[PDB]
Amino acid sequence: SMKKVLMLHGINHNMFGKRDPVQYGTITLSEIDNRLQALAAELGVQVESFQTNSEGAMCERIHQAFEERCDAVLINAGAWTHYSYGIRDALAILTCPVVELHMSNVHAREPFRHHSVFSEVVVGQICGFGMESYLLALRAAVAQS
Amino acid sequence: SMKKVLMLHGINHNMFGKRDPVQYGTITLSEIDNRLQALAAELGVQVESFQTNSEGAMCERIHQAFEERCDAVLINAGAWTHYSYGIRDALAILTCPVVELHMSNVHAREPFRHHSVFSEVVVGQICGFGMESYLLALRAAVAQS
Amino acid sequence: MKKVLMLHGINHNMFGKRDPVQYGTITLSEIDNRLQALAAELGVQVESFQTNSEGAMCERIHQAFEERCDAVLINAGAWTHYSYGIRDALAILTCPVVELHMSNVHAREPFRHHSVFSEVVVGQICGFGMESYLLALRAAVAQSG
Ligand SMILES: [Cl-]
């Protein structure tokens, strides 16, 4: 009865918040997932989170989301965003809304981060708002429904 | 005494034929392998099929094909065709004929699919003929040996 | 005692296993032995790691961050020219990182001319064959002390 949203954390994201606190902050993947769960309860949906450093494991989770008729997918694939055509063609299989998000303003960083290979297979993109990027992406998917 | 040919299916190809039949058809990897097995028997050769979504598993299968003195290799690496230099340098270890193939006319799709990073390490390429691309590739490999 | 980590990249398990006349016989085992011999001479410890999985490489780099490795040597193979995932894993490190190659990559195919690691390494050593590894270990020890 409840809509299911899948959160896909990308390569190197298990290391969020484990670097120098003064320069990189302390936000961890665990805190992000808690904030997503907090907002999900108010929105009346379920959020399941998945993190991997393996491109094949990411694609196979996407395949599973297609077969399990997931209602919406949020993805911050990390560096994969800028070259992994395999994940791009995995996301293309999905028929539910796909929301791309980034904590940082990728369009103002190194040139290679300015381009996303997912642009044609996602509804839209959100970047630059830190932790709030995740919550805004969850909001975007729920409003799509 | 029989020649052994290895068929390498690439990333996301386990999902062949599991999408909308009206838009994507119903051709599955299982149906492809059966038609390959039928042609191999008619041609007097052996065909072994392998699919993976892991770039390392694909490279390691190629290493195994080199050590096992495989007679010819057919590869449809999927999206890996357009960026995986790792699979490219794996194919370069082979000394048997290598045939690159695609079901679709990749040179008439998105620009990133126009270029194959395998071009310098394969005998040639076959694309655009759907199921027949696999059967033509097997014929090409047998004639190369 | 100072610890240096040697990271061997994709396809490198096949070093020395190709045609000896054309590709030589230098193996990863022989390289690691020479590294251990020089490490004892230099008064440091060397640990070697090889993988064909991009995710496994990034996770070894995460472990190198947690274990407070003194220096990292990396010859990522073909990943050098496209794996932004490994690049962003290396960016987490705060110890000196030395990129190395046996061949003169800047005089090979154009795609090998560029390393996506250049902004996250101290420097690069290429072209000196087996000596590239030994020179890189010397570079890393001098960077620490
Ligand atoms: Cl609200």
CA-CA distance, C79 to C82, in Å (whole number)? Answer: 5
What is the DSSP pairing of strand A3-9 with strand A45-51? parallel
Contact (Cβ atoms closer than 8 angstroms) between residue B30 and residue B16: no
From C128, A88, C37, select the one nearest B81 (Cα to Cα).
A88
Q: Which region holds residue B44: left if phi is over 0, alpha if psi is between -120 and 50, else beta?
A: left
> Is A83 in contact with B80 (Cβ distance < 8 A)?
no
> Is A90 in contact with B14 (Cβ distance < 8 A)?
no
CA-CA distance, C12 to A94, in Å (whole number)? Answer: 36
CA-CA distance, A39 to B36, in Å (whole number)? Answer: 51
Contact (Cβ atoms closer than 8 angstroms) between residue B137 and residue B101: yes
* Dihedral angle sign, alpha carbons of residues A30, A36, A42, A47: negative
- Say whether residue A18 is in contact with chain C using an 8 A CB cutoff: yes
> Is A59 in contact with B78 (Cβ distance < 8 A)?
no
> Scanning the structure block, which residue is given the tokens 């369009």?
A107
Token pair belonging to C33: 């032995």
Neighbours of chain B (3+ CB pairs under 8 A): A, C
| Residues annotated in a binding site of B for substrate | 76, 82, 89, 103-104, 113
CB atoms within 10 A of CB A105: 11
CB atoms within 10 A of CB B55: 28
Angle between helices B55-67 and A55-67 (to 10 degrees): 120
Helices (H), chain C: 20-23, 28-42, 54-66, 84-90, 130-144
Tell me if A89 is assigned to a ligand binding site: yes
| Residues annotated in a binding site of C for substrate | 75, 81, 88, 102-103, 112
Contacting residues of A for B52, CB less than 8 Å apart: 56
At A88, the amino acid letter reads R
Beta-bridge partners for C26: none
Give the nearest partner residue to B78 out of A83, A86, A120, using CB atoms: A86
Contact (Cβ atoms closer than 8 angstroms) between residue A7 and residue A51: no
> Is C89 in contact with A55 (Cβ distance < 8 A)?
no
> Which residues touch C117 (CB under 8 Å, ≥6 apart)?
C74, C76, C80, C86, C87, C90, C97, C99
Cα R_g (chain B), whole angstroms: 14
Instruction: Calculate the alpha carbon distances from C145 to C1, C7, C76 in Å.
Output: 12, 21, 25
At B40, the amino acid letter reads A
Experimental method: X-ray
Q: Which residue of the set B24, B83, B114, B115 is catalytic?
A: B24
At B80, the amino acid letter reads W
Token pair belonging to B132: 């027949």
Instruction: Calculate the alpha carbon distances from A10 to A22, A51, A53, A83 in Å.
Output: 24, 6, 6, 13
| Full set of structural domains in chain C with CATH | 1-145 (3.40.50.9100)
CB atoms within 10 A of CB B49: 18
Residue of B nearest to A88 (CA): B79
Query: In three state form, how does the secondary structure of chain A look?
Result: CCEEEEEEECCCHHHCCCCCHHHHCCCCHHHHHHHHHHHHHHHCEEEEEEECCCHHHHHHHHHHHHHCCCCEEEEECHHHHHCCHHHHHHHCCCCCCEEEEECCCHHHCCHHHHCCCCHHHCCEEEECCCHHHHHHHHHHHHHHC
Q: E strands within chain B? A: 3-9, 45-51, 72-76, 98-102, 124-127
- The distance from CA B34 to its chain's CA centroid, rounded to whole angstroms, is 15
Q: Which residue of the set C8, C23, C113, C114 is catalytic?
A: C23
CA-CA distance, C73 to C138, in Å (whole number)? Answer: 10
Instruction: Calculate the alpha carbon distances from B36 to A11, B60, B111, B121, B133 in Å.
Output: 36, 23, 30, 23, 10
Reported resolution in A?
A: 2.6
- Based on DSSP, count helices (H) and strands (E) in chain B, helices before strands: 5, 5
Give the nearest partner residue to B83 out of A85, A90, A95, using CB atoms: A85
CA-CA distance, B54 to B52, in Å (whole number)? Answer: 5
B133: three-class secondary structure by DSSP: helix
Angle between helices B29-43 and B131-144 (to 10 degrees): 30
Strand order in the sheet with A124-127: A45-51, A3-9, A72-76, A98-102, A124-127
Contacting residues of C for B117, CB less than 8 Å apart: 111
Shortest alpha-carbon distance between residue C53 and chain B (Å): 5
Token pair belonging to C125: 């050593």
Residue C113 DSSP code: G
Neighbours of chain A (3+ CB pairs under 8 A): B, C
Tell which of B11, B59, B68, B88 to mutate to test the C interface (max C CBs under 10 Å): B59
- Say whether residue B104 is in contact with chain A using an 8 A CB cutoff: no
Give the nearest partner residue to C10 out of B59, B66, B67, using CB atoms: B59
From C109, C112, C134, select the one nearest C33 (Cα to Cα).
C134
Residue of A nearest to C68 (CA): A19
Question: How far away, in angstroms, is A49 Cα from ligand 1 center?
Answer: 21
Shortest alpha-carbon distance between residue C59 and chain A (Å): 8
B24 catalytic? Reply is yes
Contact (Cβ atoms closer than 8 angstroms) between residue A32 and residue A134: yes
Shortest alpha-carbon distance between residue C89 and chain A (Å): 6
* Burial (CB count within 10 angstroms: exposed 0-12, middle 13-18, buried 19+), residue A1: exposed
Instruction: Calculate the alpha carbon distances from C37 to A16, C16, C40, C74, C100 in Å.
Output: 37, 20, 5, 18, 19
